Amino acid sequence: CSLIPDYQRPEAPVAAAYPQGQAYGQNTGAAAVPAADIGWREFFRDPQLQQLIGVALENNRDLRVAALNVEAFRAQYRIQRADLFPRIGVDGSGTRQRLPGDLSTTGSPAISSQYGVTLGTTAWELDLFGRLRSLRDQALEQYLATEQAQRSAQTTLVASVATAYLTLKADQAQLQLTKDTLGTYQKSFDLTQRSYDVGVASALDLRQAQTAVEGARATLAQYTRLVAQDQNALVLLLGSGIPANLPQGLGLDQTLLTEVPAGLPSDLLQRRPDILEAEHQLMAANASIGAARAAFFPSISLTANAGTMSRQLSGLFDAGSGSWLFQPSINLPIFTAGSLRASLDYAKIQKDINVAQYEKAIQTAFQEVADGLAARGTFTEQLQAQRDLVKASDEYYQLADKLFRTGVDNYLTLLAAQASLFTAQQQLITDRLNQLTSEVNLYKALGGGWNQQTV
Amino acid sequence: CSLIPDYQRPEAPVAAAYPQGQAYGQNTGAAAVPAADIGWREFFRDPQLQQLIGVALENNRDLRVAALNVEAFRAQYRIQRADLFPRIGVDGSGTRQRLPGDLSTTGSPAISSQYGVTLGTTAWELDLFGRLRSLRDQALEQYLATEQAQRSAQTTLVASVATAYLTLKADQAQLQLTKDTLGTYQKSFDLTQRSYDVGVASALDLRQAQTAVEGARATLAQYTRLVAQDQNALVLLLGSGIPANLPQGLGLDQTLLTEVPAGLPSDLLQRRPDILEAEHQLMAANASIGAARAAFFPSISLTANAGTMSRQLSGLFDAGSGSWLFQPSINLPIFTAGSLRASLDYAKIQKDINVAQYEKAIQTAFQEVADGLAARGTFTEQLQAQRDLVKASDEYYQLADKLFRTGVDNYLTLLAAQASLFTAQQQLITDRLNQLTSEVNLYKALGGGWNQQTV
Amino acid sequence: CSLIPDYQRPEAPVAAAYPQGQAYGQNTGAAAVPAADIGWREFFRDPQLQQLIGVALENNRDLRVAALNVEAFRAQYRIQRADLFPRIGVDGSGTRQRLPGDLSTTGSPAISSQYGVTLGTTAWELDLFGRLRSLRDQALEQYLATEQAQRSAQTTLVASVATAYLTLKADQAQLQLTKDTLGTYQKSFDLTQRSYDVGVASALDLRQAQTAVEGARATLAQYTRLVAQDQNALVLLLGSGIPANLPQGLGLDQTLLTEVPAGLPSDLLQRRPDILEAEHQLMAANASIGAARAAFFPSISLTANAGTMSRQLSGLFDAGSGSWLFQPSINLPIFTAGSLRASLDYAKIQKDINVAQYEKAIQTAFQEVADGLAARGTFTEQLQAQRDLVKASDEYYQLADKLFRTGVDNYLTLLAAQASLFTAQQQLITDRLNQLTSEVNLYKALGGGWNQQTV
């Protein structure tokens, strides 16, 4: 029989609904198709990104280690499941000993000999009180936990590839913007040099143009480096080189992601892989309490073989030399100086530790999803404000330029307007990147992209 | 007897006093009430923060795992302490075997049978040279180490909750400042629109006001997000929701912390929990050398039972069927092909590793405390300078505004002054946050807040 | 015999050459003296840095733990290598038991006794199918892996000490620059106060000078703190205090590093320590497959002693009381309910996991080296651009100042020029630091500085 305690899922120590406030929209509530069911093929619209995610799914080495781990823990479960059954082997044994007279059978010193070849089992533990089965069930729960760990690793890898691709694309946009602004500054500096060679443009205007040109050159080199390093990061995350015939990707100003629902927090318990990993770890910890308990009950062992035995090696397998052995044992502990009780306390404390860690997994998932929702409820406003700021700075630069052709202004206000426009556009690229990254992380936290197509 | 080497605490490989220089004040020297004795109820003046720290102390799941760990290592010590005593059980044994004629007692093939029920101990190791006791003492030292680990986890959690609360408060202040500055910019933009509709204000002034308004709007959205995310972070660190009836908190411009003393570096050895954890780990490593050594001396074992035995099952417990067994053993190793010596080398290298790790713990604590002191000796000057900068920028903005009502200046100098004032105030909030965080981390490094009230 | 599979190094899952693009120079190809052979005494020209690296090599505690680890894994290999040979000990045994009549030799209840002192081995496993040798070879491969781990730790420590020294030096330069700019601002503010007391300088100019002075004061305090904290970081990385009589160091504007070659990616396989660590881990995983396999073949055991035995304690060691025992065993498993097969699957999956982790080590090294090359191919351009920007801002400030002595400009353009110059110089210091750090990390990734002199 089995001494495992009944397993009861701990209550989620999180609020019943995601936090509401100035940064949060209205709670959508229960979703018909939850985020974890929305495949990454549908969440990510960019087909090049989809083919890259597929390349990573099939070539990233960390995900490969995760899948191998599932296989190893399945082996371990299988090793524990086998230990229930008697191990049956062939045993060849010989014994040849000299013995002094007071211990020999003859009364004088003697050389005795004995030989046997038997088929049987030694010290087989008859799982009467479920110790071995408890250990099997803990192995099984740790294996299910490893499976959930693989699914979590995949969601992590998907989000990592998306973020690497988006970061490379954003830095490529920054590089292009810097190229355009450097070309503008270089044209302006050459015109100002020609106007200074004729005594019209002052040295002040020329030096300010030169500062603008050098600053743009330095930022150009910086973003050139960042673009190459983002390529390297993406190649590492893919586990393979970038394919040559990739489909056409979408630019940052397109709709790149599907707006995934928030759902209820409780959905996480059933749909977020690392929470299910935590829960299977807890169910294993619980399973091991059965073993700790079974130790106090009687242990039943059996040693049994059948085969041939003889005093002479020449008499083996020979008619009239058959032998067999049946040897049962029971052991009931009485006194261990508190050992068995301390072992059971250990088992119980382990269950408690796993309870705390499952609860902490739930709280961490809640915090990550609430942070994603606070980012969803504010990046739209911040991006509208940043688009309006880019527009207003462009209007101001165009007005200063239309005033410049009629003189009036000096060659400082125009450079200031251009610098502010460049900074505003860099910040707009960065903000778009941050909004896309927050949305990807929210998809991951809700249940991620374990599915390729939507279930 | 016991072969554990004498334990001698390694010398602290740090300077005798904290580093002195331009960033450090004068060394206060030995403190009457050291930082580790100052309770977190006294260190933190904000009563809302105190109630939040209490909520975290009773609901954070990592601290719960730490406390459970102390209990598990205590179980393990108890399991090792029991192994000294003989395990006494009841043993039921049966043996029924067929044997060929040349091996049977009758000279022809025979079925013999034997049964016994005894009370006794099997293979009990008489701890003569202290092997088992060495292992017990290593278990005990690892348990004391786990206790110190819990205390370190609590200090870490206290500092983390303080820093989360201060970060939420600072970002709320940034949000309020941004609201005020956005309202000012919006009033100014509406007045400039009305002045432009009558041909008085130029399009340049209007576009610059619009850029200011959009920038403030974007920063407003950003800080709105940060405030919500800081709330989420704090809720995760509490392990529970924020309580509704919290006392009134103190604002950032108040005195939030007590200035804790620096003390001597040596104080750390006796008062910083992770150093004591390291030292108990080392004392355990040392304890295990006793076991490694005891292996070379004789091992003494005893098997002893008393009970009933009989050739027939029907003859058990029956008068004249009593039996008893006394079976001692000594084993002295002679040749192991260097095994035992390599085992002892392993034990000794482990002691050495723990020595290095205790020393590294001391050096790390010294570096953290010296960094806290370098922050204490400079944040005051930086905060004075930043207050003076905010004041000077406010004077400049007020003078530009008092000049604006009489025309003279354009609608660009005023916006520049307002932008500089806003940036200076943001930096002042950030600097106050950094000073408070550095002070909290210094309290943690010195010995933290294991005590609630001052001892 | 041995059932270990043949070991075949996995193909490098990286491109045949480092990535080429706008941020990368032309591939130098195979180097005559590869980076891993260039000693850190030659790579780092600053002799003070060399003496500091030596101090860290001999006093850093993490590197000490790494070296101790090599010694511990060597002990473990030695413990496994010994297990091949029979453990020979002296065995003292006694047995005194009462037995009921139906089981005694006399037919009535009897007390029998037996004593022996023998020299021999018990249950010695004759490594016929290489199980023990397989475990030895896995121990040996894990030891070689630990050796490579030490070398990687040293390269890491060297790069960490270089980066700590360069960061301290850069922040000291920032502190000196801030001191100079604060002195300039203070002189200018005092002159403006004297010019305002006579009604010449406006309050606007005075307030703007005061803002500049306070900003410089705050930045001064910040960099003062950073310098002290960098000192603390360096002291922690050294494991010892800074020596007093250090040689003269080189300034940031000097040539501090030797430009190390890139070489081929394949060079990493043979020259980067953590890849060789990964490979030895894989060779160990492979080695353990031999043990998993050997389990299925017959196990051969021997128990053999020679000594004295007697029915009376007084008859030991006595002429005619010699005895000896020769007891061989063979065990061939037949049925284990899939256990042995699951054990072999486990071994094989472990080999596969180590394959994936070695491949991932190769890909990570490639990405780190490609990032170092993308930094090498762009920091030169960015630093030229930043020097030109500092020069142009200095020209602009000098022209504005030469115009100021003849009045014309107000006391705002000069402060703006000074602020831009200060920011440009800070960014130039930061860029030089980043270029030096990237070059150090590239040296580490290529093979680091395991050698002191060049091999």
Ligand SMILES: CCCCCCCCO[C@@H]1O[C@H](CO)[C@@H](O)[C@H](O)[C@H]1O
């Ligand atoms: C003589 C051998 C009998 C050994 C007892 C076997 C105990 C069987 O145990 C059963 O095995 C199944 C899979 O193995 C599982 O489905 C059951 O849950 C499990 O209880």
Ligand SMILES: CCCCCCCCO[C@@H]1O[C@H](CO)[C@@H](O)[C@H](O)[C@H]1O
């Ligand atoms: C025919 C042998 C019966 C074995 C005793 C009970 C073992 C229970 O074990 C079950 O035995 C089944 C076959 O009997 C197998 O198909 C199952 O895999 C196994 O779980």
Ligand SMILES: CCCCCCCCO[C@@H]1O[C@H](CO)[C@@H](O)[C@H](O)[C@H]1O
């Ligand atoms: C007649 C009494 C028979 C005793 C046989 C079983 C004794 C079990 O002992 C009990 O086992 C429990 C585990 O489930 C533990 O919780 C208890 O602490 C332990 O006392």
Ligand SMILES: CCCCCCCCO[C@@H]1O[C@H](CO)[C@@H](O)[C@H](O)[C@H]1O
């Ligand atoms: C591993 C199984 C070992 C037990 C196999 C023995 C099967 C039954 O044992 C039989 O019992 C009879 C009388 O009791 C004898 O006459 C037979 O010789 C004997 O084989």
Ligand SMILES: CCCCCCCCO[C@@H]1O[C@H](CO)[C@@H](O)[C@H](O)[C@H]1O
């Ligand atoms: C020449 C090398 C071969 C060595 C033979 C080893 C086998 C030893 O032979 C032994 O000798 C005994 C006599 O004392 C015989 O009675 C035994 O039957 C036999 O086991």
Ligand SMILES: CCCCCCCCO[C@@H]1O[C@H](CO)[C@@H](O)[C@H](O)[C@H]1O
């Ligand atoms: C290494 C394992 C091989 C198995 C041994 C073959 C089985 C031996 O076979 C036996 O040999 C005896 C002669 O000694 C004969 O008396 C038996 O009839 C015969 O069955």
Ligand SMILES: CCCCCCCCO[C@@H]1O[C@H](CO)[C@@H](O)[C@H](O)[C@H]1O
């Ligand atoms: C046959 C089993 C014997 C059980 C022996 C003692 C069981 C618990 O031990 C108790 O703990 C006390 C601690 O002071 C000891 O003094 C006593 O042995 C006993 O009262």
Ligand SMILES: CCCCCCCCO[C@@H]1O[C@H](CO)[C@@H](O)[C@H](O)[C@H]1O
């Ligand atoms: C066979 C009896 C030998 C002497 C009995 C020693 C019993 C030791 O006493 C043990 O002390 C522990 C606390 O220290 C308790 O937890 C154990 O229950 C108790 O049995």
Ligand SMILES: CCCCCCCCO[C@@H]1O[C@H](CO)[C@@H](O)[C@H](O)[C@H]1O
């Ligand atoms: C017959 C059982 C005797 C076993 C030897 C017991 C060894 C006792 O050992 C003692 O036990 C105490 C707590 O357990 C400790 O206070 C002592 O430091 C320890 O030496």
Ligand SMILES: CCCCCCCCO[C@@H]1O[C@H](CO)[C@@H](O)[C@H](O)[C@H]1O
């Ligand atoms: C009464 C049994 C004596 C046991 C032999 C020495 C065991 C020493 O052990 C001690 O025994 C004490 C009771 O004697 C217990 O109170 C202690 O917990 C225990 O440490």
Ligand SMILES: CCCCCCCCO[C@@H]1O[C@H](CO)[C@@H](O)[C@H](O)[C@H]1O
């Ligand atoms: C007459 C000689 C008696 C030998 C019995 C003990 C032999 C101990 O042997 C010694 O034990 C020490 C551990 O303390 C080790 O340091 C030594 O290397 C080992 O040789």
Ligand SMILES: CCCCCCCCO[C@@H]1O[C@H](CO)[C@@H](O)[C@H](O)[C@H]1O
């Ligand atoms: C676990 C303890 C087992 C030993 C208990 C036996 C107690 C003493 O043993 C006694 O010795 C006497 C002569 O030597 C005999 O007359 C007694 O029958 C016998 O019980």
Ligand SMILES: CCCCCCCCO[C@@H]1O[C@H](CO)[C@@H](O)[C@H](O)[C@H]1O
């Ligand atoms: C009908 C199902 C019950 C099976 C009974 C199993 C007990 C076997 O009974 C055995 O048989 C022997 C004869 O060879 C007896 O002499 C033994 O006393 C007995 O152990």
Ligand SMILES: CCCCCCCCO[C@@H]1O[C@H](CO)[C@@H](O)[C@H](O)[C@H]1O
């Ligand atoms: C399962 C454990 C139960 C313990 C068995 C009860 C003890 C048996 O009791 C014994 O039974 C004998 C008859 O066979 C009698 O001769 C003995 O007098 C009686 O004490």
Ligand SMILES: CCCCCCCCO[C@@H]1O[C@H](CO)[C@@H](O)[C@H](O)[C@H]1O
């Ligand atoms: C009874 C114990 C026997 C001890 C056997 C050898 C002890 C150490 O072994 C030594 O190492 C040498 C290595 O070349 C071997 O040649 C020799 O066996 C021996 O000199």
Ligand SMILES: CCCCCCCCO[C@@H]1O[C@H](CO)[C@@H](O)[C@H](O)[C@H]1O
């Ligand atoms: C019983 C003797 C069997 C042959 C003796 C083999 C002894 C192996 O020699 C061993 O080699 C090691 C170095 O390799 C040494 O560290 C060991 O001390 C030495 O004993």
